[PDB]
């Protein structure tokens, strides 16, 4: 489908569009009229299953499982860089990498690392810091 063979991360709102119609006529699917799914490839990973049913009935399940066996850690990738301020998508994803897929921990070792570089303070201590805030990045970094 050309445009669509990178990530479904960087697919813009046309990307979208096309992959819908791709999908549409490769799977025989009912009409989908691409007014829906008014988004990007970004904003797609974060729509659940139940959504893509509302948005599509006759063909919403399908396009979900679709788009899992395309591309699973795009959607923790996303939730790391929405958890943390300014991370890149190769932060998220060596992050997540060590945390083995573990988006907790992934998000919270990105936000001790984020402490840490605005401090002068040991790192064991912007782990306490972040914690007595409730690893609430913005309140643990105003204290610096």
């Not at 691409?34 to 970004?42: D, L, Q, R």
């Not at 509302?54 to 939730?79: A, N, V």
């Not at 919270?108 to 402490?115: E, H, I, T």
Request: glycine share 4%; charged share 25%; aromatic share 10%.
């Amino acid at each position: 489908p050309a445009h669509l063979r990178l990530q479904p991360i960087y697919w813009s709102r046309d990307d979208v569009a096309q992959w819908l119609k791709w999908a549409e006529n490769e799977f025989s699917l009912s009409p989908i009229d691409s007014n829906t799914f008014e988004m990007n490839g970004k904003a797609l990973l974060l729509l659940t299953k139940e959504d893509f049913r509302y948005r599509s009935p006759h063909s919403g399940d399908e396009l979900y499982e679709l788009l899992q066996h395309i591309l699973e850690l795009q959607r923790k990738i996303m939730e790391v860089e929405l958890s943390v301020h300014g991370v890149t998508h190769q932060e998220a994803q060596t992050a997540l990498g060590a945390t083995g897929g573990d988006v907790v921990s992934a998000i919270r070792n990105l936000k001790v690392d984020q402490l840490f570089h605005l401090s002068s303070r040991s790192r064991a201590d912007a782990w306490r810091i972040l914690e007595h805030y409730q690893w609430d990045l913005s309140a643990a970094s105003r204290y610096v």
